[PDB]
């Protein structure tokens, strides 16, 4: 579940992203951003899995959904 993406992880990600200070509201915003992205990619990865008649999502399957 989504609250399992922690404040510290979000700051490390932001730090790596060059962000220096952040609003308290970034935390929930960043979670919204990741839920949506994951839902898009995953739904596509799985759809292509399913299409190829497999039942095991591969690394090219994910890589397709990114494309």
């Amino acid at each position: 579940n989504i609250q399992g993406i922690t404040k510290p992880a979000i700051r490390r990600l932001a730090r790596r992203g060059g962000v220096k200070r952040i609003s308290g509201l970034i935390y929930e915003e960043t979670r919204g951003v990741l839920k949506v992205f994951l839902e898009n990619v995953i739904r596509d990865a799985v759809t292509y899995t399913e299409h190829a008649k497999r039942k095991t999502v591969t690394a090219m399957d994910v890589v397709y959904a990114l494309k």
């Binding site: 992880a9 990600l13 932001a14 994951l38 799985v46």
Partner: protein
């Protein structure tokens, strides 16, 4: 180098997948979950940078949700 713990990231991914498949059982190669997380992270990081040029652009130094939302809006 992954900044989100693999297990919290994996539960999420499974919950998301399960809320989509809703009963159809799929397996995930450990290398599928990993590749996903790389992409998940790398997206957040670029998204953070872009949103931050917006912040700077507004004279500020503190990232605001409007910085992130503008960035996404400009990406499409």
């Amino acid at each position: 180098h992954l900044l989100i713990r693999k297990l919290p990231f994996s539960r999420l991914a499974r919950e998301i997948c399960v809320k989509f498949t809703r009963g159809v059982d799929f397996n995930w190669q450990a290398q599928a979950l990993l590749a996903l997380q790389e992409a998940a992270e790398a997206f957040l990081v670029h998204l953070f940078e872009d949103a931050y040029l917006l912040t700077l652009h507004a004279g500020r130094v503190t990232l605001f949700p409007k910085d992130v939302q503008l960035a996404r809006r400009i990406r499409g």
